[PDB]
Ligand SMILES: Cc1cc2nc3c(=O)[nH]c(=O)nc-3n(C[C@H](O)[C@H](O)[C@H](O)COP(=O)(O)OP(=O)(O)OC[C@H]3O[C@@H](n4cnc5c(N)ncnc54)[C@H](O)[C@@H]3O)c2cc1C
């Protein structure tokens with residue numbers, strides 16, 4: 032079998048690269064280990080920034096987001112009795128963030144790709160990548176017991192942290208940067224009206240909590256939990272009590288609780304790999320980099336990687352200027368390390384850390400009292416939260 | 426013997442409190458373990474901010490600083506080949522910093538106090554503090570073998586980190602916050618014209634370096650050195666070679682070197698104690714708090730403590746409103762913890778740390794690439810470097 036671009040993974044990154052390219056006359060095939068159903072069970076992300084809003088419009092898939100997504104102009108941080116709002120519209124010069132669930136984003140792109148008739152093979156087993164430094168790479172895989180060959184020009188690894196494509200690169204050609212954090216986020220999605228018009232992040236003695244939303248009648252809540260915990264030990268009851276124990280009393284009394292639709296523990300991680308390419312293989316999104324979700328940056332980096340990868344592949348097919356695709360990693364990593372620093376600062380000022388000594392607790396709070404009470408301090412959080420500018424290409 | 430205020434220590438803090446009070450008709454005695462000569466051998470500080478410039482004028486001791494001090498409008502940070510200037514005048518709204526040596530500051534106040542005839546006892550041995558929670562405290566001490574009694578109303582501990590007065594408080598009434606850093610600053614003062622019109626701070630692979638000045642013909646240089654080192658192992662030659670090894674090549678070639686006037690290793694420390702008072706005893710300056718010299722904040726906190734202590738003692742004697750001196754610590758500590766966070770951030774982004782793993786080196790550099798390339802990021806360093814506002818009293 033044959034195609035121009037082969038994309039491994041059909042989550043936000045595989046599907047958006049796939050769509051942008053189909054619209055530009057550049058053929059592509061997506062390969063996904065799981066089912067449409069299993070991919071849609073993953074609740075993940077609520078907050079989108081301008082880059083990803085503009086790209087979903089560039090791929091003509093913006094309709095349901097323009098009606099149903101929520102434009103937010105501020106967010107609140109709760110610490111030590113206080114409750115402080117960062118006005119993102121004015122501390123960043125008009126930028127806002129968009130609340131629209133990741134399940135929904137994925138649904139819009141799964142419906143769009145289906146309508147145009149571009150190839151997608153779900154349940155594609157044991158994907159292997161071959162001949163990466165040659166002029167004609169290929170993907171082998173198994174569909175219902177039969178082992179098949181797909182030839183392409185170029186391969187995009189959009190397959191997440193556990194995907195086969197970063198492990199398909201010689202480990203000596205790669206430099207891994209990692210930090211594991213001693214906690215996870217216990218999440219709980221409920222069909223309840225949210226506790227505030229805006230998102231509330233909270234540093235509490237007992238550990239972190241976050242009040243998010245998916246729409247006017249759906250809510251997403253997290254509490255920081257230890258690496259030892261397991262979801263079957265946190266009953267809906269247990270959770271709501273602990274979430275209320277971590278909020279300002281006049282937020283917790285206004286809380287409308289209800290039964291979970293979904294409950295799960297995500298571990299926290301900072302991960303970068305350099306380079307983000309090998310030969311004809313280009314890693315994008317979570318294949319190449321993980322951030323802790325505290326700063327809402329995961330989909331911010333997927334969109335700029337994908338925007339950069341699409342823009343350089345157009346130049347390579349429409350324009351014959353194919354030399355420029357070796358500029359991929361250097362363009363991407365400048366943006367990855369600033370969103371990685373933002374995601375770590377966020378994480379470390381808002382979570383409770385094991386065997387923190389007296390001095391560092393005091394510094395952590397003073398960090399929050401400074402950045403939130405200073406015009407310039409606030410603007411450093413706000414321009415990072417709404418996304419920094421994109422980079423020059425040529 | 427008797428006085429109104431007794432001040433333990435005749436460095437920048439004891440002398441400035443002492444002077445301000447003599448001018449307001451409030452009598453005071455200073456007690457100092459060492460000699461005038463030994464106190465003046467201590468080279469310490471080069472950078473002063475607006476609060477301390479204005480206070481030295483309030484105490485009428487500003488003359489030689491107005492002629493001889495240097496007004497600086499920017500400072501430079503060197504990291505990874507780059508060399509970036511923070512314009513402090515415009516990123517903070519007109520504020521500047523003053524380069525004038527601490528030896529000189531102390532000399533101006535030792536000469537002023539001498540002219541007015543206010544009491545100073547140098548070589549005062551084994552100062553003990555007695556009866557602190559009573560209505561009539563006193564200092565005992567020994568002058569040339571004879572053990573003498575000094576009665577006062579109130580005592581100011583302006584005696585540094587090693588002073589007897591913080592140890593004179595019941596250890597249970599105190600909460601100590603401390604961080605020891607795994608390095609020191611090797612310093613070297615030379616009678617050479619400085620390498621730049623402005624101060625250069627440098628993060629280099631080999632460890633930290635700083636290019637400072639005392640005037641157009643005198644220079645102050647430091648290199649970060651390990652806690653194991655001893656000054657007799659660093660010859661002037663050894664030092665100059667290492668300082669040149671840590672600078673941008675086109676700074677190191679322009680360097681005019683020469684023999685040391687002074688050479689010494691200061692260990693780095695963050696220290697806070699809460700409260701900053703006990704009964705009739707009020708700690709000020711370095712008695713109460715230590716910062717690493719990276720942010721030039723030590724004399725910034727001495728001046729606001731002293732300004733606050735003077736202002737509340739005037740109110741207590743001129744106005745009979747003596748209740749307000751229990752507001753001392755809460756007023757001071759708000760300013761101490763923001764200058765302590767600034768001094769730690771500074772310290773950790775610019776020094777080389779032991780068993781730093783791949784991820785944190787990358788974050789440390791990304792910290793520097795962000796704060797220096799963002800308008801808001803730069804303003805957070807600049808308003809902290811020139812000193813934040815002072816606090817409301819009433
Ligand atoms: C709790 C949580 C909250 C988050 N909240 C936010 C938020 O508000 N905002 C934000 O910006 N980010 C957030 N994120 C991050 C965001 O969810 C991710 O960055 C996003 O899912 C990345 O898209 P992706 O397509 O690159 O990878 P994924 O979404 O992981 O998709 C990769 C796909 O590849 C498939 N694949 C894997 N291995 C193979 C293989 N061998 N062969 C074929 N296919 C394979 C997988 O089955 C999967 O479908 C959050 C993440 C978590 C965990």
Ligand SMILES: Cc1cc2nc3c(=O)[nH]c(=O)nc-3n(C[C@H](O)[C@H](O)[C@H](O)COP(=O)(O)OP(=O)(O)OC[C@H]3O[C@@H](n4cnc5c(N)ncnc54)[C@H](O)[C@@H]3O)c2cc1C
Nearest residue numbers: 434436437438469470471472584585588710711721723724
């Ligand atoms: C390398 C270095 C560089 C620095 N650079 C700067 C800079 O550029 N800018 C800045 O803002 N800060 C800087 N500082 C900090 C600044 O030097 C200090 O904060 C400053 O000396 C504090 O003044 P002080 O009077 O409170 O304490 P000190 O200056 O320490 O004086 C206290 C005095 O009390 C006396 N004393 C002690 N024990 C007793 C006792 N039992 N009885 C009686 N008297 C006693 C001592 O002998 C001494 O004279 C630097 C410090 C160092 C170490």
